[PDB]
CSV table of C-alpha atoms in Angstrom, one decimal:
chain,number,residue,atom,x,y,z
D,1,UNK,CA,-44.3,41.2,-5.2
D,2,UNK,CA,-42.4,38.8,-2.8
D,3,UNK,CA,-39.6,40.4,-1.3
D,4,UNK,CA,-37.0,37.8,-1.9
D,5,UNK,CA,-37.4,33.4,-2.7
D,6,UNK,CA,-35.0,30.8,-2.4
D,7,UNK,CA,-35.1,28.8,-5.4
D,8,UNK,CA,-35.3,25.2,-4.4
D,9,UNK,CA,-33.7,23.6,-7.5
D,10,UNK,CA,-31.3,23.8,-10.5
D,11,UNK,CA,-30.1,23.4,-13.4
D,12,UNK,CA,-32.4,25.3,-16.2
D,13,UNK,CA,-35.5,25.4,-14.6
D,14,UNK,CA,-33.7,27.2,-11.4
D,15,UNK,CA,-32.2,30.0,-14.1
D,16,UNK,CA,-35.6,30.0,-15.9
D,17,UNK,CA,-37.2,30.9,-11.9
D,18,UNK,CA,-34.5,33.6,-12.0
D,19,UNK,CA,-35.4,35.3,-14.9
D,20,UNK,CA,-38.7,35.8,-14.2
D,21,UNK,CA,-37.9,36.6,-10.4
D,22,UNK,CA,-35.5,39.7,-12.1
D,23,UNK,CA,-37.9,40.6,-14.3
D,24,UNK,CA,-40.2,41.2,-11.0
D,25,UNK,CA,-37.7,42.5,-9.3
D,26,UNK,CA,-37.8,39.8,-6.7
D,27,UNK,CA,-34.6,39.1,-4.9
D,28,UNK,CA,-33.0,35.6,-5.6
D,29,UNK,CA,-31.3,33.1,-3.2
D,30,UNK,CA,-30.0,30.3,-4.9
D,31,UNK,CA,-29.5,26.6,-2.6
D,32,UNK,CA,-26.9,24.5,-3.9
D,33,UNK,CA,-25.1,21.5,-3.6
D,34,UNK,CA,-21.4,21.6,-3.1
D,35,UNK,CA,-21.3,19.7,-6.9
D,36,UNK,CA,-23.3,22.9,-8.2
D,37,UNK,CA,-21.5,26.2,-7.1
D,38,UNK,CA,-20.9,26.8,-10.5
D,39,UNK,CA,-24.5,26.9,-12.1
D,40,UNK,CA,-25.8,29.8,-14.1
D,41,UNK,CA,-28.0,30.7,-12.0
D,42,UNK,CA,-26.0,30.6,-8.7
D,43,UNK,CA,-23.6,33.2,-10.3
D,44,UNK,CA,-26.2,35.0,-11.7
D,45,UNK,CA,-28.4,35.0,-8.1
D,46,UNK,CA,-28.4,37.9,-5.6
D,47,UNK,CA,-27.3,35.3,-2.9
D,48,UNK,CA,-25.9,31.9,-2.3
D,49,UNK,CA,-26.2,29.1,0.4
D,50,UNK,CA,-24.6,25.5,-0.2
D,51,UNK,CA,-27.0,23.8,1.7
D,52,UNK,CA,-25.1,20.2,1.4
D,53,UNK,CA,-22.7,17.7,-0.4
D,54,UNK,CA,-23.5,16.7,-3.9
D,55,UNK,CA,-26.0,13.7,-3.5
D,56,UNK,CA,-29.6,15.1,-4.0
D,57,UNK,CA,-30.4,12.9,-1.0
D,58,UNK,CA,-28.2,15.2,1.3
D,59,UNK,CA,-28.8,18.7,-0.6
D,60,UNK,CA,-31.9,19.2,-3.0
D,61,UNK,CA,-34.0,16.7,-0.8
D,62,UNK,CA,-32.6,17.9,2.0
D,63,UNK,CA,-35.8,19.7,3.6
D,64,UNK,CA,-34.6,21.4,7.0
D,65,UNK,CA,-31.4,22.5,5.1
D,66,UNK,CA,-33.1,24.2,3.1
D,67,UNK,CA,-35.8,25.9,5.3
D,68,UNK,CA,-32.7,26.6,7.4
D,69,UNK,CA,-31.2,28.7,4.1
D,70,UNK,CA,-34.5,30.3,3.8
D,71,UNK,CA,-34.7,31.4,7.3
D,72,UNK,CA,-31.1,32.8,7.6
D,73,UNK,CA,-31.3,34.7,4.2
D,74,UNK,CA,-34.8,36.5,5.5
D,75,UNK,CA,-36.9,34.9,2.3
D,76,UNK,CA,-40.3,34.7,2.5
D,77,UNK,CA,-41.1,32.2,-0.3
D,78,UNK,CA,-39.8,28.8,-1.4
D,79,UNK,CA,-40.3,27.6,-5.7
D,80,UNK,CA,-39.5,24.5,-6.0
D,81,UNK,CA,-39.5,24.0,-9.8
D,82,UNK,CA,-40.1,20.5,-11.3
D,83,UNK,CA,-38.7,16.9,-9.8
D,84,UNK,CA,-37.2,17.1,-6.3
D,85,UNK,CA,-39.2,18.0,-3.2
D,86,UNK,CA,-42.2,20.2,-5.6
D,87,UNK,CA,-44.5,17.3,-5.5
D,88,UNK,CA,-43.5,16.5,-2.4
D,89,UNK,CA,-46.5,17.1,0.5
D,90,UNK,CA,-44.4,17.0,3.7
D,91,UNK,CA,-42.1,19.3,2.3
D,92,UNK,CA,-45.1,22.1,0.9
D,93,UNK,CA,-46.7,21.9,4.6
D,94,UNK,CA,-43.1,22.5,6.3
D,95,UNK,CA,-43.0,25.4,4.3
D,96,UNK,CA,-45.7,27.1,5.0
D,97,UNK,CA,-45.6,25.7,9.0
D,98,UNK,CA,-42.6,27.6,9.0
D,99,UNK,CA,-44.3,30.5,7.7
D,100,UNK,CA,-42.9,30.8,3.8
D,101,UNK,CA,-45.2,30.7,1.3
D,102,UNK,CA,-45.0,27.8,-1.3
D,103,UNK,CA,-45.1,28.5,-4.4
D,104,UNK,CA,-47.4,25.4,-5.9
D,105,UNK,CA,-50.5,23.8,-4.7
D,106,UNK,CA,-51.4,23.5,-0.7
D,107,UNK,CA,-50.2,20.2,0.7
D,108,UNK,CA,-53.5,18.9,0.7
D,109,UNK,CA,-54.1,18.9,-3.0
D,110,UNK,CA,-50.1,17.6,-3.4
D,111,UNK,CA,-51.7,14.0,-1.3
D,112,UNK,CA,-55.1,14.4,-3.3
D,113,UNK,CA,-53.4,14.4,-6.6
D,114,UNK,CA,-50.3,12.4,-5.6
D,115,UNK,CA,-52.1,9.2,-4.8
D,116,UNK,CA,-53.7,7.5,-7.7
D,117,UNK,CA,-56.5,6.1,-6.3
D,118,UNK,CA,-57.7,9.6,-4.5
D,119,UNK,CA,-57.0,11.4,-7.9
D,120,UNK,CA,-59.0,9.2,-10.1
D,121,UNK,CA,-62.3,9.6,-7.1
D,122,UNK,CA,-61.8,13.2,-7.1
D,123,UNK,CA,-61.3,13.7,-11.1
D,124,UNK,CA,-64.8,11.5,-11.5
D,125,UNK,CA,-66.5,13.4,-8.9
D,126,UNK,CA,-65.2,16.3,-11.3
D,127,UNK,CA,-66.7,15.5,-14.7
D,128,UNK,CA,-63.2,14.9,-15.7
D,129,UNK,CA,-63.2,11.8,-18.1
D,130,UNK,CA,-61.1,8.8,-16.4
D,131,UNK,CA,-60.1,5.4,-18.0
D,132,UNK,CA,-63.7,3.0,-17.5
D,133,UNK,CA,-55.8,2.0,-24.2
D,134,UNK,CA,-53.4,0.3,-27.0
D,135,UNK,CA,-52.7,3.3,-29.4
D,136,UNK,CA,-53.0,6.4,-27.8
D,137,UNK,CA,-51.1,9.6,-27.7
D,138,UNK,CA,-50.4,11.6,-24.5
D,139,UNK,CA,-52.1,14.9,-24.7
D,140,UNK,CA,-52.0,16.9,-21.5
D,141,UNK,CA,-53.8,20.2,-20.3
D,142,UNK,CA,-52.0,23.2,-18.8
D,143,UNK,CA,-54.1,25.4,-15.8
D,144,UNK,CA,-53.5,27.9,-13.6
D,145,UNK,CA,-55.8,28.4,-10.7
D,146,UNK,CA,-55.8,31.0,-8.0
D,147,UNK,CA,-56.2,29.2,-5.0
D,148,UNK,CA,-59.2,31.8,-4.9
D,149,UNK,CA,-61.8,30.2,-6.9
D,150,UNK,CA,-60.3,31.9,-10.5
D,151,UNK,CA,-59.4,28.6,-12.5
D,152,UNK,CA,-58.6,28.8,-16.4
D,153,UNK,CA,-56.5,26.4,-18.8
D,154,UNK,CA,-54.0,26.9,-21.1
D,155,UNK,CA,-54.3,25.2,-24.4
D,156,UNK,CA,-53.1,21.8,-24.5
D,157,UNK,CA,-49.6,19.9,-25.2
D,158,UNK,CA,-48.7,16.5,-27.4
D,159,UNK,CA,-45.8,14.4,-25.6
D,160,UNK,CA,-46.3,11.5,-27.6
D,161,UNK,CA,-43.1,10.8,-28.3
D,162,UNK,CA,-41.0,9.2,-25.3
D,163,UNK,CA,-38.8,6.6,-24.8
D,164,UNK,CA,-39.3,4.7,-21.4
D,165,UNK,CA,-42.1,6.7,-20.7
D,166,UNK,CA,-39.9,9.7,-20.4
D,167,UNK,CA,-40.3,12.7,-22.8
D,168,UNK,CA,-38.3,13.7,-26.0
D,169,UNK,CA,-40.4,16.1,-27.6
D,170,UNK,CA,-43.0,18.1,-26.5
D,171,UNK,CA,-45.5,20.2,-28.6
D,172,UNK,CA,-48.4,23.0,-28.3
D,173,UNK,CA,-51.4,22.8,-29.6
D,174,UNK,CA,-51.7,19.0,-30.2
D,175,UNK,CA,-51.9,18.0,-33.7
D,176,UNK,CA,-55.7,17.1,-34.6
D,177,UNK,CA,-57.2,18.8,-31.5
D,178,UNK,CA,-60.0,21.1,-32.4
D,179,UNK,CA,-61.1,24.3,-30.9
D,180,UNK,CA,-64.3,22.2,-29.9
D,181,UNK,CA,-62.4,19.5,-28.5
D,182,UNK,CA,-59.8,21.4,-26.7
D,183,UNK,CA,-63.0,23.9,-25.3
D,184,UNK,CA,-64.5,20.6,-24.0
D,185,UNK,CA,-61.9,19.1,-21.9
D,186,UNK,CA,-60.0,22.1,-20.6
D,187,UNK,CA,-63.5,23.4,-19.3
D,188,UNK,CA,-63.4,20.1,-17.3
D,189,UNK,CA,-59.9,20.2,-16.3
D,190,UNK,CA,-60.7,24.4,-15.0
D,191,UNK,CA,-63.7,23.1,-13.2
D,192,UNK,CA,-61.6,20.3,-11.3
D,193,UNK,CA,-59.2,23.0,-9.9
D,194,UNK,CA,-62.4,24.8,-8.5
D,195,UNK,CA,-63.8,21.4,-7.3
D,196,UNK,CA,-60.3,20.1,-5.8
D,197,UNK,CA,-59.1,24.0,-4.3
D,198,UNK,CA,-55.9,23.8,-7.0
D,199,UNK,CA,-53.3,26.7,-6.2
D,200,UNK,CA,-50.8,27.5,-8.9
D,201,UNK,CA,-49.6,26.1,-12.1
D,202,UNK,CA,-50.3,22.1,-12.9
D,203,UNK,CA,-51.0,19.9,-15.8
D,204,UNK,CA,-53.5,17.3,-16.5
D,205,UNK,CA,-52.5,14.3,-18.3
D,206,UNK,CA,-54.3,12.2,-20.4
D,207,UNK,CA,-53.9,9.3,-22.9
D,208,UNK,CA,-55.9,10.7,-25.7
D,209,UNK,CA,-57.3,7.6,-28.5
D,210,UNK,CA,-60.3,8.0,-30.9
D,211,UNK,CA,-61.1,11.5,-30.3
D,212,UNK,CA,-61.6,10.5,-26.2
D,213,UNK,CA,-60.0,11.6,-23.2
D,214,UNK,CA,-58.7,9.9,-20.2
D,215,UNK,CA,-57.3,11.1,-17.5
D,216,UNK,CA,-53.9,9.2,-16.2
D,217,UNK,CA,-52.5,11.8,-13.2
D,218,UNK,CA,-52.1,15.1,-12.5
D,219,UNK,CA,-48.8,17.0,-12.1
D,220,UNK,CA,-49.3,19.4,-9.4
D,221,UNK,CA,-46.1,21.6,-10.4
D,222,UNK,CA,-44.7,23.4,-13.3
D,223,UNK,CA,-43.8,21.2,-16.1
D,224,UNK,CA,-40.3,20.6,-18.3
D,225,UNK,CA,-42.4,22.2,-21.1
D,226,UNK,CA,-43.9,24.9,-20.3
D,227,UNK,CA,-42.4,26.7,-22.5
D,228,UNK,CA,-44.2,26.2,-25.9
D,229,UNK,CA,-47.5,26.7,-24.0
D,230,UNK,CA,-46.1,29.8,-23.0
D,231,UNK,CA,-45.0,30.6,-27.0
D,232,UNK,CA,-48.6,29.9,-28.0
D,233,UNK,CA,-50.6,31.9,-25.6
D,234,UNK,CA,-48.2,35.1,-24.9
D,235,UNK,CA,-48.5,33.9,-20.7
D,236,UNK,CA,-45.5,33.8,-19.3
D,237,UNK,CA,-46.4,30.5,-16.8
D,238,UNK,CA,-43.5,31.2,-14.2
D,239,UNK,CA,-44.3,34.9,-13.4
D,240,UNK,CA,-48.2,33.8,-13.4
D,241,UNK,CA,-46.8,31.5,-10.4
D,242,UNK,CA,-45.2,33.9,-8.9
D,243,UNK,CA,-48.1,36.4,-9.2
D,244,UNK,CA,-50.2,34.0,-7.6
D,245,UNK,CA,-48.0,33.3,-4.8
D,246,UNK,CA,-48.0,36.7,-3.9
D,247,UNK,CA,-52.0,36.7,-3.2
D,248,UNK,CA,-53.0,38.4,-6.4
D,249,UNK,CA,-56.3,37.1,-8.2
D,250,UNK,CA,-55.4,35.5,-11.8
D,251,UNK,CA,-54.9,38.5,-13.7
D,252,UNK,CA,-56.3,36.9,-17.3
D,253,UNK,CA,-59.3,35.5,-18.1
D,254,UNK,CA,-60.9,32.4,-19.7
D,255,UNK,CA,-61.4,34.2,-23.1
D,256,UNK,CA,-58.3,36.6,-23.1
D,257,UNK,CA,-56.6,33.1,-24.1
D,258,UNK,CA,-55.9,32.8,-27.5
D,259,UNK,CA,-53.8,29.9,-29.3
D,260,UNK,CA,-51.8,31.6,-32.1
D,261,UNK,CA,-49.1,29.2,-34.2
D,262,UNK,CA,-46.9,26.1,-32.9
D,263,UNK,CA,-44.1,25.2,-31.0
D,264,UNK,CA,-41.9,22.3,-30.0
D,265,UNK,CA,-39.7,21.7,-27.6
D,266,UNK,CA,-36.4,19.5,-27.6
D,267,UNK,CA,-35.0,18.1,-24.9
D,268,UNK,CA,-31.4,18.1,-24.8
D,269,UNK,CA,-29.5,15.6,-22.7
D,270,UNK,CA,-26.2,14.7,-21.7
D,271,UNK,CA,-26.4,11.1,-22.9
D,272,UNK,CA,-24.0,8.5,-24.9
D,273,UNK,CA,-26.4,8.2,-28.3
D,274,UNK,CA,-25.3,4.6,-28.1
D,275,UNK,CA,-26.8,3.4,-25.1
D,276,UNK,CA,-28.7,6.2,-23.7
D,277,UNK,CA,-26.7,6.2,-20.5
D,278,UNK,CA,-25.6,9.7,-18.8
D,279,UNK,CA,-21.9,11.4,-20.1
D,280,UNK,CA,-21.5,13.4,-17.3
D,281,UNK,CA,-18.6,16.1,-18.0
D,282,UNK,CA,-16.7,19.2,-19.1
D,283,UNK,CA,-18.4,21.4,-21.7
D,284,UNK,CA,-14.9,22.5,-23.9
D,285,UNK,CA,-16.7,24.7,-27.1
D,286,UNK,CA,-20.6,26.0,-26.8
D,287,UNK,CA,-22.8,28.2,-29.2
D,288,UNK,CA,-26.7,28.5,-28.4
D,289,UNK,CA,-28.6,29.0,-31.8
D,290,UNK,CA,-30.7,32.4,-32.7
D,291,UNK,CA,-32.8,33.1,-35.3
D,292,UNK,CA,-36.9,35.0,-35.0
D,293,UNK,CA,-38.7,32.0,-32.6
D,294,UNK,CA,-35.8,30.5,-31.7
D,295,UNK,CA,-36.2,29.7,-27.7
D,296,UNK,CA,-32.5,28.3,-25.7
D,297,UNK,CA,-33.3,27.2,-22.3
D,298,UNK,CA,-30.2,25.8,-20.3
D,299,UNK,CA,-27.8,26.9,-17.7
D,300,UNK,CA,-24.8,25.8,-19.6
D,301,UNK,CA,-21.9,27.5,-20.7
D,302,UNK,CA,-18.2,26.9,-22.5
D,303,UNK,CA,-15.9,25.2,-19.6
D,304,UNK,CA,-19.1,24.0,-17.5
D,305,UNK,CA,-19.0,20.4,-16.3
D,306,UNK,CA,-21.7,18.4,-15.9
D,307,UNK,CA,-21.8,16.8,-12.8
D,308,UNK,CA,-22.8,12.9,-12.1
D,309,UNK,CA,-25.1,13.3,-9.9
D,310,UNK,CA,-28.2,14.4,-11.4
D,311,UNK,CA,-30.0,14.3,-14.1
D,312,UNK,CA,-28.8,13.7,-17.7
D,313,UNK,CA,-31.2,16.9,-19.2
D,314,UNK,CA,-28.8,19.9,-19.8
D,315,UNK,CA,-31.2,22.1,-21.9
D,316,UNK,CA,-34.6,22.7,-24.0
D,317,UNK,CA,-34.7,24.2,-27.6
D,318,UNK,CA,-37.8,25.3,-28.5
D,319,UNK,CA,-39.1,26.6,-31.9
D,320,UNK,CA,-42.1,28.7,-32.4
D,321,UNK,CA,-43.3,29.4,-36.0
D,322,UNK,CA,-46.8,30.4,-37.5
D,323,UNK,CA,-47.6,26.9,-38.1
D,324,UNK,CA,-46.7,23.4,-37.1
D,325,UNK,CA,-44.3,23.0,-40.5
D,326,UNK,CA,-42.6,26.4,-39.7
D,327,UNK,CA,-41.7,25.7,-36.1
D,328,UNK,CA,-40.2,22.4,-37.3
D,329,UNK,CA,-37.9,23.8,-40.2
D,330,UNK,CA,-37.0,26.2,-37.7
D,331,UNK,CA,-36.3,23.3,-35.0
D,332,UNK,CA,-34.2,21.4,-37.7
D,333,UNK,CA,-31.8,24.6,-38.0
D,334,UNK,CA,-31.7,25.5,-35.1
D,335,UNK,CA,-30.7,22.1,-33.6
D,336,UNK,CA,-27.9,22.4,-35.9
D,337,UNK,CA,-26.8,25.5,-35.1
D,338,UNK,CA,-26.0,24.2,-31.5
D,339,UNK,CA,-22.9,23.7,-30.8
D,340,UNK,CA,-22.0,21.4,-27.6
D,341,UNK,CA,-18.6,19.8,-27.4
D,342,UNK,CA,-16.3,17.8,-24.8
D,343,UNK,CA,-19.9,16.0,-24.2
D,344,UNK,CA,-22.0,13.4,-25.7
D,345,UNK,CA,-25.5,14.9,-26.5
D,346,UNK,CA,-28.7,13.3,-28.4
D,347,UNK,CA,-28.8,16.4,-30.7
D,348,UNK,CA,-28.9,13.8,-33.4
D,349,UNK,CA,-31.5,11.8,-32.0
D,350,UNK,CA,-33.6,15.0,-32.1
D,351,UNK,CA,-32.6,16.1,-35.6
D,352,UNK,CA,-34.0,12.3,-36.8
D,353,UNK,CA,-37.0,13.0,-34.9
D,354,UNK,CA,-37.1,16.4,-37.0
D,355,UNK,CA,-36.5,14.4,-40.0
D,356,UNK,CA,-38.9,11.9,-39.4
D,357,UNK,CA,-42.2,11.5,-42.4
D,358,UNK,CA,-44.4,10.6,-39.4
D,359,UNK,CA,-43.7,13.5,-36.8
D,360,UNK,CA,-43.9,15.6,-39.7
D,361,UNK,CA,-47.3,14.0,-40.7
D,362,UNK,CA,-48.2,14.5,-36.9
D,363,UNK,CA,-50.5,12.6,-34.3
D,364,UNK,CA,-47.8,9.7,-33.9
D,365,UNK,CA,-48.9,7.3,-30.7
D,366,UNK,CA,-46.5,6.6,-27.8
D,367,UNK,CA,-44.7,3.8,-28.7
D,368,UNK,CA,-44.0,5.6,-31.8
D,369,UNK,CA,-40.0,6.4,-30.9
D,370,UNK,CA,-39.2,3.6,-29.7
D,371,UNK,CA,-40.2,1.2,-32.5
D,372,UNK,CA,-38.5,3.7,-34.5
D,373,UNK,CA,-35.0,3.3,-32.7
């Protein structure tokens, strides 16, 4: 394995990188802003460098302060999780100029997939079905790909329900998708990471309206919800990176991917439920829920502040059951099991969700939530 990475981000997706980094036995060096010293996953990390003030402009952006960390700590890798510089071309071909290796596509494929019209030319060329849509849902495909001509998928995920295009709940598999169906596109979403050179973990997005695919963009990093694709398939995605990054050969095959029962994931934010505008602040009582395929993803902890400057998403629940009506029933008691005071949260918002005939029914369109609320 890699001998030791810095962890270019924070918040839960930093402490999920450094689970799976310990479970490796990869040594951890955690980049912070001077807002962040007190993250999970900076006490929990092997080492620490504050590589700026709290803005993300002058820390998590920061690109030669944080090549600079990973230089003076002796890493030889660089994950930058989701958001921030992981999409970010200039930043993977600084990486690897300086001799790191990047954990996530080559900068060439970042600029292929990062500019519209490119993507769109190179998805056709593909076989990948484009747009030639009023009610559609959004139904994306998870891959990992080698970077060595080994390219399989992952099953599929429903976001449909987002409010200012942003996500709210995520599931896997999508309501209504078929094996047939889900054969069909995520053969052509495999074959585009072979066509295209894809390295790493990415997702294919599409709006998805009378049993037809097309293709919107392509996230060329890990995604928020990754984990109920993980729940359904048994693959843990981050370690797959990781594995990859190292120079080893995908280690599972096409068929050795199974889909077995449903998960959904809830996003919980640090938000007034009023206005949907960020309450930052101090965290005064917490208690994560348990419970058999119960899944708490979050970095916070009793007396932890939120800071200002990032962000409003402090944490993911996600609920894995045999079936779709399983995972939800466990979803409903689990999000009231959670216990987060001091803070405003939308733990409500996502309990209505729960609640709602619709969701329950399944297959509800995008613009579902919002005509909801």
């Amino acid at each position: 394995m890699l001998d030791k990475i810095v962890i270019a981000n924070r918040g839960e997706i930093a402490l999920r990188i450094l689970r799976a980094c310990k479970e490796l036995g990869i040594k951890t060096v955690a980049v912070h802003s001077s807002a962040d010293r007190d993250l999970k996953h900076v006490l929990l990390a092997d080492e620490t460098v504050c590589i700026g003030p709290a803005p993300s402009v002058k820390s998590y952006l920061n690109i030669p302060a944080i090549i600079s960390a990973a230089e003076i700590t002796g890493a030889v890798a660089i994950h930058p999780g989701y958001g921030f510089l992981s999409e970010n071309a200039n930043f993977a071909e600084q990486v690897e100029r300086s001799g790191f290796i990047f954990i996530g596509p080559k900068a060439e494929t970042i600029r292929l997939m990062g500019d519209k019209v490119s993507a769109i030319a190179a998805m056709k060329k593909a076989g990948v079905p484009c747009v030639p849509l009023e009610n559609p849902r959004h139904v994306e495909i998870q891959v990992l790909a080698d970077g060595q001509g080994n390219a399989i998928y992952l099953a599929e995920r429903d976001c449909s329900m987002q409010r200012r295009h942003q996500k709210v709940v995520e599931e896997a598999p999508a309501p209504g998708i078929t094996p047939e169906l889900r054969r069909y596109i995520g053969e052509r979403c495999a074959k585009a990471c072979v066509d295209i050179g894809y390295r790493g973990a990415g997702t294919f997005e599409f709006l998805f309206e009378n049993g037809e695919f097309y293709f919107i963009e392509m996230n060329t990093r890990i995604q928020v919800a990754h984990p109920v694709t993980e729940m359904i398939t048994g693959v843990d995605l981050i370690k797959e990176q990781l594995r990859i990054a190292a120079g080893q050969p995908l280690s599972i095959k096409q068929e050795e991917v199974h889909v077995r029962g449903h998960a959904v994931e809830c996003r919980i934010n640090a938000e007034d439920p009023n206005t949907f505008l960020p309450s930052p602040g101090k965290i005064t009582r917490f208690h994560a829920p348990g419970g058999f395929g119960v899944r708490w993803e979050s970095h916070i902890y009793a007396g932890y502040t939120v800071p200002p400057y990032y962000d409003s998403m402090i944490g993911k629940l996600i609920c894995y059951g045999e079936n779709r009506d399983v995972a939800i029933a466990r979803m409903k008691n689990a999000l009231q099991e959670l216990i987060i005071d001091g803070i405003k949260t939308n733990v409500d918002l996502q309990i209505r969700i729960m609640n709602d005939e619709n969701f329950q029914h399944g297959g509800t369109n995008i613009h579902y939530l919002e005509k909801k609320l």
